[PDB]
RNA sequence: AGAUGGUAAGGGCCCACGGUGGAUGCCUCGGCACCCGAGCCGAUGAAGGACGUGGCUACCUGCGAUAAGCCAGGGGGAGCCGG
């Protein structure tokens, strides 16, 4: 389910929308980053938080 | 004075039961032949690779830093996150 709506609302960047397509991306990578250095750690993981998120940055990066 | 009897360190044949070995039978996801179909790919970067890619991943497979995956259309109708 988690498709629909966001990809939606993805388009639905268009205030300022391919600068934002970035800029969101920017921002999940960031969140990509600290989640698996999270993982790293290990006490501050809990797995498909990451797949989760590579997935929003493919259907960001579109 | 005399006579021919038991011994088995070990060995031989026979029976029995094991070990080892992987023949025989049955099996088959593979192979072989024929026939039919189909028959080009590439600078819009092929064929084929290297290195990567999974939360934990050695390998195989899939994939390409959007990395066992992204979008959309079609199919399908309870399961799914490969081996
Ligand atoms: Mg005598
Ligand atoms: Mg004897
Ligand atoms: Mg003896
Ligand atoms: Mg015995
Ligand atoms: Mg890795
Ligand atoms: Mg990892
Ligand atoms: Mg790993
Ligand atoms: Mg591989
Ligand atoms: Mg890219």
Known sequence: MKLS???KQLEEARKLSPVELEKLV????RE????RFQASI?????NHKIRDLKRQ??????
């Open 32 to 35: 990509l980053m600290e989640l």
């Open 26 to 29: 920017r921002e999940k990578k």
């Open 5 to 7: 709506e966001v990809r």
């Open 42 to 46: 290990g006490q501050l993981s809990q």
């Open 57 to 62: 940055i493919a259907r960001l990066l579109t």
